[PDB]
Amino acid sequence: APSRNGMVLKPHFHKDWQRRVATWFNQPARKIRRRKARQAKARRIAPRPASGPIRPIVRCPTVRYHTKVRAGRGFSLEELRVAGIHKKVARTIGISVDPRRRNKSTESLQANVQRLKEYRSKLILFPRKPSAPKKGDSSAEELKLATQLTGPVMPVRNVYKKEKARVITEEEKNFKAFASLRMARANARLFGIRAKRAKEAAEQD
Amino acid sequence: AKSKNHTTHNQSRKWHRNGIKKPRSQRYESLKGVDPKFLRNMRFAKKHNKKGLKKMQANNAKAMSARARKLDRLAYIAHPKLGKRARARIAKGLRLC
Amino acid sequence: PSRLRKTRKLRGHVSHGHGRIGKHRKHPGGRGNAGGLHHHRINFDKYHPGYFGKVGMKHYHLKRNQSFCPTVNLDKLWTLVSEQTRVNAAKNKTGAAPIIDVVRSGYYKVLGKGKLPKQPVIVKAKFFSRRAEEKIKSVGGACVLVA
RNA sequence: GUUCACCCACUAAUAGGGAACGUGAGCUGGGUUUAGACCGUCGUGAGACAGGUUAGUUUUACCCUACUGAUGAUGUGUUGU
RNA sequence: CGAUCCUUCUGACCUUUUGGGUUUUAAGCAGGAGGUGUCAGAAAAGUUACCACAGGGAUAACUGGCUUGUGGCGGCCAAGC
RNA sequence: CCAAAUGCCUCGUCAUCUAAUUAGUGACGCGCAUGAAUGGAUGAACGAGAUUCCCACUGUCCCUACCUACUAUCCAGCGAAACCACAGCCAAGGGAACGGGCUUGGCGGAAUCAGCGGGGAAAGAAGACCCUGUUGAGCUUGACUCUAGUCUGGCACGGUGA
RNA sequence: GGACCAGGGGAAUCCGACUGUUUAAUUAAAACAAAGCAUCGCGAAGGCCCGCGGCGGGUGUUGACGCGAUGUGAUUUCUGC
RNA sequence: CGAGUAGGAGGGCCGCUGCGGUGAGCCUUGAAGCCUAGGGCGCGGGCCCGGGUGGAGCCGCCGCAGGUGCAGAUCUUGGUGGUAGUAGCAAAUAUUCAAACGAGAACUUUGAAGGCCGAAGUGGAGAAGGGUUCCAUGUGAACAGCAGUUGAACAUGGGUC
RNA sequence: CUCGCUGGCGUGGAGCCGGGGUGGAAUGCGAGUGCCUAGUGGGCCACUUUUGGUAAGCAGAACUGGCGCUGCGGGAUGAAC
RNA sequence: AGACUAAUCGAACCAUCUAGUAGCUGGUUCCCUCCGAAGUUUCCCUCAGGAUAGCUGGCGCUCUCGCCCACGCAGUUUUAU
RNA sequence: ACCCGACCCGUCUUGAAACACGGACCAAGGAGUCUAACACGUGCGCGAGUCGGGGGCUCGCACGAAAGCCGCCGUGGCGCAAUGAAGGUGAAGGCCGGCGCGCUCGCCGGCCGAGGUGGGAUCCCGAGGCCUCUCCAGUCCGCCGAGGGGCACCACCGGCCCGUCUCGCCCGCCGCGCCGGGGAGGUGGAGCACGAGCGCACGUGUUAGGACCCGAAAGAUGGUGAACUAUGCCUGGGCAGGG
RNA sequence: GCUAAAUACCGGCACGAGACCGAUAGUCAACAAGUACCGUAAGGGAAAGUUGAAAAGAACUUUGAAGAGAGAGUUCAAGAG
Ligand SMILES: [Mg+2]
Ligand SMILES: [Mg+2]
Ligand SMILES: [Mg+2]
Ligand SMILES: [Mg+2]
Ligand SMILES: [Mg+2]
Ligand SMILES: [Mg+2]
Ligand SMILES: [Mg+2]
Ligand SMILES: [Mg+2]
Ligand SMILES: [Mg+2]
Ligand SMILES: [Mg+2]
Ligand SMILES: [Mg+2]
Ligand SMILES: [Mg+2]
Ligand SMILES: [Mg+2]
Ligand SMILES: [Mg+2]
Ligand SMILES: [Mg+2]
Ligand SMILES: [Mg+2]
Ligand SMILES: [Mg+2]
Ligand SMILES: [Mg+2]
Ligand SMILES: [Mg+2]
Ligand SMILES: [Mg+2]
Ligand SMILES: [Mg+2]
Ligand SMILES: [Mg+2]
Ligand SMILES: [Mg+2]
Ligand SMILES: [Mg+2]
Ligand SMILES: [Mg+2]
Ligand SMILES: [Mg+2]
Ligand SMILES: [Mg+2]
Ligand SMILES: [Mg+2]
Ligand SMILES: [Mg+2]
Ligand SMILES: [Mg+2]
Ligand SMILES: [Mg+2]
Ligand SMILES: [Mg+2]
Ligand SMILES: [Mg+2]
Ligand SMILES: [Mg+2]
Ligand SMILES: [Mg+2]
Ligand SMILES: [Mg+2]
Ligand SMILES: [Mg+2]
Ligand SMILES: [Mg+2]
Ligand SMILES: [Mg+2]
Ligand SMILES: [Mg+2]
Ligand SMILES: [Mg+2]
Ligand SMILES: [Mg+2]
Ligand SMILES: [Mg+2]
Ligand SMILES: [Mg+2]
Ligand SMILES: [Mg+2]
Ligand SMILES: [Mg+2]
Ligand SMILES: [Mg+2]
Ligand SMILES: [Mg+2]
Ligand SMILES: [Mg+2]
Ligand SMILES: [Mg+2]
Ligand SMILES: [Mg+2]
Ligand SMILES: [Mg+2]
Ligand SMILES: [Mg+2]
Ligand SMILES: [Mg+2]
Ligand SMILES: [Mg+2]
Ligand SMILES: [Mg+2]
Ligand SMILES: [Mg+2]
Ligand SMILES: [Mg+2]
Ligand SMILES: [Mg+2]
Ligand SMILES: [Mg+2]
Ligand SMILES: [Mg+2]
Ligand SMILES: [Mg+2]
Ligand SMILES: [Mg+2]
Ligand SMILES: [Mg+2]
Ligand SMILES: [Mg+2]
Ligand SMILES: [Mg+2]
Ligand SMILES: [Mg+2]
Ligand SMILES: [Mg+2]
Ligand SMILES: [Mg+2]
Ligand SMILES: [Mg+2]
Ligand SMILES: [Mg+2]
Ligand SMILES: [Mg+2]
Ligand SMILES: [Mg+2]
Ligand SMILES: [Mg+2]
Ligand SMILES: [Mg+2]
Ligand SMILES: [Mg+2]
Ligand SMILES: [Mg+2]
Ligand SMILES: [Mg+2]
Ligand SMILES: [Mg+2]
Ligand SMILES: [Mg+2]
Ligand SMILES: [Mg+2]
Ligand SMILES: [Mg+2]
Ligand SMILES: [Mg+2]
Ligand SMILES: [Mg+2]
Ligand SMILES: [Mg+2]
Ligand SMILES: [Mg+2]
Ligand SMILES: [Mg+2]
Ligand SMILES: [Mg+2]
Ligand SMILES: [Mg+2]
Ligand SMILES: [Mg+2]
Ligand SMILES: [Mg+2]
Ligand SMILES: [Mg+2]
Ligand SMILES: [Mg+2]
Ligand SMILES: [Mg+2]
Ligand SMILES: [Mg+2]
Ligand SMILES: [Mg+2]
């Protein structure tokens, strides 16, 4: 079968694929199902925003993506506890709750507490009975719009650094190096044996 | 299943369709397959052409450069450029009585 | 377009462009990659050299995920910033320099070419290469690692 | 089964041949050469054996041609001798 | 005189053993072997007359044709009878 | 026990049957390759079994003839089908080597009936022989790879007492 | 026997004891069976077999004068190494 | 300068069918088809024109899209021939004369003669299976391999305690 | 001039730089170069040269042309003369 | 007897998987203009097939000839060897 | 009517009027398709970039199952960077000087910054003469010897990165170590030498898909048949005369 | 141990759309189609659309017994009976 110069092609068509093929001609219909599903979700609720649970702020776990940031799933129980509010109180406020999430980094941890202080500043709620506890006055006709768009706070807003200008100094262009990667990379590979070779040097005696 | 085995009948006629193309001419013959010790002399000889000589050789070029009659007759009548006085006598020529 | 074909030209002709004598049948030399080692070695070798055999160590659960470092060379190095800054780094000031960060644009390792801009710089990267690090020391610039 | 071959008798003589080794929609089906089977040799074996013996469906012409036989057929007006 | 895959052995005070280590085992890089004699490298017995299908006059047994050794028929020379 | 339903050479050789017998029968045995439950050899009765001979019989034949019954034949009536390139007079020629067409010649008249079977390499089936196929199926063993069962080993149920 | 109705006969050789059966649609045979003669397994928690399964089944409403497995094929005379 | 199998390209104002565009296109005052000793054009694929039939839709040009162009496959399905008024209507002995009804009689009905099945029947009754075939009347286009004034046919109506 | 090779020799030999003269047999022609790829992968005959054969309208080749793929005029007719 | 098992037997019938596979047979639908071959090499369980070259087509590209001597090329000679 | 020419078409084939095969005759049906993927070629858009292909926004307007928008939806795909089994490393030289024995020898300071040679379309400079008396003068057209900077590209040299091999030398110390780095050569690389892709469309081509149509002998799965026949089994029936 | 979402739907209940097919096409089925009819059965499984605007579907006259016709009529047309 093969011939003059061409690439080896191995397609996966020995398996009788024509019985099992999903065809996307139902693609405009579901798209109109789903706008009319979100808009049916829009006019049920009330003043509360669609996509209304607020999400936390989470850095992306790898070496590849950890220089960007992402709306996670739920505020940490210990994050949310620094704001001081109880668990199932908080979901009625409209905050997402996640028990699985730790907090190793207080720069991460306090950044979400600032976000909850933001949202609880942001919040205009309504009571059942106007006994005036954590409630709102006649407030900007339900604050000028009932519903928000794509999260309440624009969760990405990925923060950039300027560090605008500086003079270059002595002893940085004198000392820094390529080689202080290579010296340190080779330092890490030999920490085990350099510990042991000197340990059996003094164990010899 | 008996067959014919080998024949160069009609192979002379196929080869000379496009023709026996002779490579024969090109310049600066390729420099692979050379005796390596010879090449381990010559690459060094090239790299000191550049570095070793400016002032000796270029000025040395500067020194040596500072050291340095009837049928013959009508063609001249009927030439395209050399005959306009040939017409001095048929056009505005001297002939007259 | 079935109106631009070869089929629509070849009607009226008998064998439809596949030969009386050889008779295009079904699958003469097998299906697919049949007989690579046996009767198609003059095709597989001389067109796909090295298709058969093994070379290396196995690596289980290879993620494309601990080897992620998009490179850059010193041609494109000025192209991350608006070139407003390289004018205002050439504005006769002092050894003040833009701190170009390649980690922002996505580039981890800075490889090298020749011919970098004369004006002094500070590059903040995760990885450097020593030819490129010889180039930034040429212009009097600096070389800062980020971790 | 014979092609072949010898054999007794007659006779002028019992010459040799060819026509898809004439001739099977002319026949006969003896043997070769389907399935049954027995013997012998070979094979561990199923099976094999120009080795031997026996039992085993031989189709259709009304077409065209050829031939044989049967009427007729174009011209001398008609028809008869 | 002999490829891939496999095996076996040797070589660096070599690379990787998967969260970081220490060691055993294993995986690799390089060059020597253990084979494919159908020898550019399949892992391999037999019968079919109970047979079957795809086909071939590319390939036999019958005719016909070319050839005429062999068979058959004659001719020239003359040692002899 | 024999040229056998088994003997290649082989129509073995002799003897009997015949005017004449590759047949039959009897005999002879280094019997190509007989033979003992692979059953050897006999033998009455029996046979839609095989082979030969004699007597009687007769159209099997010499050597054909004749009559009858039904068809065929002709007419009244109702009436298919196989098949079929167009078609069909022969000799030689070359030709894919054995033509209805081509070439050179022989020649050649409407349309048909009843016979006949020389030709149409006639019709009837994509050759059952043979060969190729990297196509099969039934069978077989000391083919290769396996497996039902079965034979033993070990563990579990599986304890008490000397 | 006046039509109908109805055994040609002997002399023998080969094969098979005979009667029976069989290849529906190419064969009635000498082929198969057959009584006779042998040989072997097994005393039942067993022989031979079925079974996808259980100590389910058939032989077994049985018991060595029986079941199961084969060769040979009446009789007479024989059964070598 | 021109050959051409296998083959590859190019041009097609060649044809068919469907879609946007355009033709102030076309037509019950006759569209499609189809036929045509009618007039032509093109090398050709194919087209335009007249006449005749029919009676309701159709074609150009620029683009777009094909399940798009037949002599063949022991082609599939449909249809008709030559063979052809030919084979053929030949198993088991058989008809005859007259009469009636009837458009119409070698066969239907009656009557007489001549016959055969010959009691293991061409007879008298059932089990199985057939399911209205049984009976009566009525017609004669089918069907009954000729015919029919007949029937186990068609049509109507009855009957199985 | 260079050389790290050669070496009695400023020598061997390559390499590099600059300068100086186009005209070096006949003949005919416009050449050079890259991509993709169908078809093919059963051949045959003839002058001369040839191997196996007794010989072949046989089997195997070399050189060239042809039939194939190709009509037309001649060989009565024909694939190749 | 390899028989019979619903005109089916050396493994029934029916439907699906199944439009199974095939290097093997048969067919492959409009015109015109241009160009136009191969049966050979090597290897293949290769010998009725492919792979690869050769041969063919197409699409381009880079240039030169338009004006006492051109550039380049070759199934050819000539002159040397 | 007649002269001359004139074998029946497809098919395999070295060859067909073939004593080779299929073809009685007409009408309709009827056979290289579509999806994926790769490759070259070509049109178009953008250009070190490109791509909405998946989502969201538009009011829910017949055609709308369309179209338009996003850009803090460019995540990603493909490309810009390679090489190595892997740890990993990852592509600038040229010019004028200086320091050491200026050597098989490396370093120090400026100045442009992708080398060189042969070829090389086009372009530029062109001596030189060319057009009615003559001088005397600038535009001017065309020819132009020779010279010049030279594109695309090909042939060759040098260099650079990585993997490797031989050779020997010097240095740096996030801490003195079988630690990091450098040199000169020789070879392995799908690379570097001022990038050309990407997205759609069309062609031709190969491959897997029923895959140009039609074709087997079979293989398995799961089912219906003892109304014929093979044989048992229960229950019934039948057989004249004579030796 | 339980739990909506977005996801899937060639059966079923309604429904709109089609660069589709237009009776040998499309489902096998535009029609008294899973029906006529074959097989005991498992199962297999066809064909068959078209008067006209409206029935105005040809009263009556006339041969034959009637089928079948000649006159007549209805219709734009019986060249739609
Ligand atoms: Mg190919
Ligand atoms: Mg499959
Ligand atoms: Mg060959
Ligand atoms: Mg062709
Ligand atoms: Mg071939
Ligand atoms: Mg082919
Ligand atoms: Mg592969
Ligand atoms: Mg004969
Ligand atoms: Mg015989
Ligand atoms: Mg015989
Ligand atoms: Mg036999
Ligand atoms: Mg033996
Ligand atoms: Mg007989
Ligand atoms: Mg005739
Ligand atoms: Mg691990
Ligand atoms: Mg070999
Ligand atoms: Mg076998
Ligand atoms: Mg042949
Ligand atoms: Mg002789
Ligand atoms: Mg006799
Ligand atoms: Mg013996
Ligand atoms: Mg013996
Ligand atoms: Mg014994
Ligand atoms: Mg003749
Ligand atoms: Mg002849
Ligand atoms: Mg001949
Ligand atoms: Mg002859
Ligand atoms: Mg003939
Ligand atoms: Mg003639
Ligand atoms: Mg006759
Ligand atoms: Mg006859
Ligand atoms: Mg014949
Ligand atoms: Mg015949
Ligand atoms: Mg055949
Ligand atoms: Mg083979
Ligand atoms: Mg197979
Ligand atoms: Mg005896
Ligand atoms: Mg008997
Ligand atoms: Mg019989
Ligand atoms: Mg006995
Ligand atoms: Mg038991
Ligand atoms: Mg005794
Ligand atoms: Mg031409
Ligand atoms: Mg038109
Ligand atoms: Mg038209
Ligand atoms: Mg269509
Ligand atoms: Mg089609
Ligand atoms: Mg054709
Ligand atoms: Mg046909
Ligand atoms: Mg007929
Ligand atoms: Mg007759
Ligand atoms: Mg007759
Ligand atoms: Mg009367
Ligand atoms: Mg009457
Ligand atoms: Mg009687
Ligand atoms: Mg009776
Ligand atoms: Mg009655
Ligand atoms: Mg009546
Ligand atoms: Mg009748
Ligand atoms: Mg009735
Ligand atoms: Mg092609
Ligand atoms: Mg090829
Ligand atoms: Mg020859
Ligand atoms: Mg050919
Ligand atoms: Mg030619
Ligand atoms: Mg010729
Ligand atoms: Mg001629
Ligand atoms: Mg002659
Ligand atoms: Mg001829
Ligand atoms: Mg048998
Ligand atoms: Mg049967
Ligand atoms: Mg069988
Ligand atoms: Mg098919
Ligand atoms: Mg299917
Ligand atoms: Mg099939
Ligand atoms: Mg040509
Ligand atoms: Mg071959
Ligand atoms: Mg063939
Ligand atoms: Mg070409
Ligand atoms: Mg032909
Ligand atoms: Mg034949
Ligand atoms: Mg034929
Ligand atoms: Mg025929
Ligand atoms: Mg058609
Ligand atoms: Mg492209
Ligand atoms: Mg991105
Ligand atoms: Mg199999
Ligand atoms: Mg089966
Ligand atoms: Mg089964
Ligand atoms: Mg019964
Ligand atoms: Mg759980
Ligand atoms: Mg119709
Ligand atoms: Mg249908
Ligand atoms: Mg109507
Ligand atoms: Mg009347
Ligand atoms: Mg009308």
Tab-separated table of N, CA, C and O (backbone and C1' of nucleotides) in Angstrom, chain J residues 48-61:
chain	number	residue	atom	x	y	z
J	48	A	P	2.947	-16.973	-10.945
J	48	A	O5'	2.043	-15.673	-10.867
J	48	A	C5'	2.444	-14.476	-11.520
J	48	A	C4'	1.269	-13.612	-11.884
J	48	A	C3'	0.712	-12.767	-10.751
J	48	A	O3'	0.144	-11.579	-11.294
J	48	A	C1'	-0.940	-14.267	-11.502
J	49	G	P	1.046	-10.282	-11.580
J	49	G	O5'	0.890	-9.427	-10.256
J	49	G	C5'	-0.391	-9.045	-9.795
J	49	G	C4'	-0.370	-8.795	-8.317
J	49	G	C3'	0.329	-7.526	-7.879
J	49	G	O3'	-0.523	-6.399	-7.944
J	49	G	C1'	1.124	-9.330	-6.603
J	50	G	P	0.057	-4.965	-8.354
J	50	G	O5'	1.290	-4.781	-7.379
J	50	G	C5'	1.453	-3.581	-6.653
J	50	G	C4'	2.057	-3.819	-5.294
J	50	G	C3'	3.217	-2.913	-4.939
J	50	G	O3'	2.800	-1.636	-4.491
J	50	G	C1'	3.795	-5.132	-4.454
J	51	A	P	3.574	-0.322	-4.980
J	51	A	O5'	4.966	-0.416	-4.223
J	51	A	C5'	5.010	-0.415	-2.810
J	51	A	C4'	6.408	-0.605	-2.303
J	51	A	C3'	7.476	0.231	-2.964
J	51	A	O3'	7.529	1.530	-2.424
J	51	A	C1'	8.209	-1.987	-2.812
J	52	U	P	7.657	2.799	-3.385
J	52	U	O5'	9.107	2.672	-4.005
J	52	U	C5'	10.247	2.973	-3.223
J	52	U	C4'	11.483	2.341	-3.793
J	52	U	C3'	12.055	2.999	-5.024
J	52	U	O3'	12.956	4.013	-4.667
J	52	U	C1'	11.895	0.662	-5.355
J	53	A	P	12.876	5.446	-5.361
J	53	A	O5'	12.692	5.112	-6.894
J	53	A	C5'	13.370	5.874	-7.866
J	53	A	C4'	14.416	5.049	-8.554
J	53	A	C3'	14.394	5.143	-10.061
J	53	A	O3'	15.129	6.253	-10.515
J	53	A	C1'	14.479	2.873	-9.409
J	54	G	P	14.402	7.415	-11.329
J	54	G	O5'	14.301	6.810	-12.793
J	54	G	C5'	15.485	6.394	-13.447
J	54	G	C4'	15.238	5.306	-14.453
J	54	G	C3'	14.185	5.584	-15.501
J	54	G	O3'	14.678	6.399	-16.548
J	54	G	C1'	13.922	3.392	-14.656
J	55	C	P	14.201	7.921	-16.693
J	55	C	O5'	12.966	7.812	-17.672
J	55	C	C5'	13.085	7.098	-18.886
J	55	C	C4'	11.782	6.460	-19.282
J	55	C	C3'	10.578	7.368	-19.284
J	55	C	O3'	10.509	8.148	-20.460
J	55	C	C1'	10.031	5.266	-18.339
J	56	U	P	10.131	9.703	-20.393
J	56	U	O5'	8.579	9.704	-20.109
J	56	U	C5'	7.690	9.062	-20.998
J	56	U	C4'	6.287	9.259	-20.531
J	56	U	C3'	5.991	10.684	-20.154
J	56	U	O3'	5.645	11.474	-21.270
J	56	U	C1'	5.286	9.256	-18.417
J	57	G	P	5.985	13.036	-21.288
J	57	G	O5'	4.815	13.664	-20.432
J	57	G	C5'	3.480	13.411	-20.815
J	57	G	C4'	2.521	13.685	-19.702
J	57	G	C3'	2.559	15.092	-19.174
J	57	G	O3'	1.826	15.954	-20.008
J	57	G	C1'	2.518	13.572	-17.373
J	58	G	P	2.247	17.481	-20.161
J	58	G	O5'	1.912	18.085	-18.740
J	58	G	C5'	0.561	18.332	-18.417
J	58	G	C4'	0.413	18.676	-16.971
J	58	G	C3'	1.015	19.997	-16.547
J	58	G	O3'	0.162	21.087	-16.829
J	58	G	C1'	1.657	18.323	-15.041
J	59	C	P	0.767	22.494	-17.288
J	59	C	O5'	1.186	23.179	-15.919
J	59	C	C5'	0.209	23.504	-14.943
J	59	C	C4'	0.816	23.597	-13.569
J	59	C	C3'	1.879	24.658	-13.399
J	59	C	O3'	1.352	25.945	-13.190
J	59	C	C1'	2.674	22.628	-12.527
J	60	G	P	1.719	27.080	-14.246
J	60	G	O5'	3.267	26.839	-14.499
J	60	G	C5'	4.210	27.854	-14.207
J	60	G	C4'	4.852	27.652	-12.865
J	60	G	C3'	6.143	28.408	-12.644
J	60	G	O3'	5.918	29.750	-12.293
J	60	G	C1'	6.433	26.191	-11.972
J	61	C	P	6.688	30.904	-13.077
J	61	C	O5'	8.174	30.745	-12.557
J	61	C	C5'	8.442	31.004	-11.193
J	61	C	C4'	9.746	30.411	-10.742
J	61	C	C3'	10.996	31.012	-11.339
J	61	C	O3'	11.339	32.248	-10.758
J	61	C	C1'	11.161	28.668	-11.365
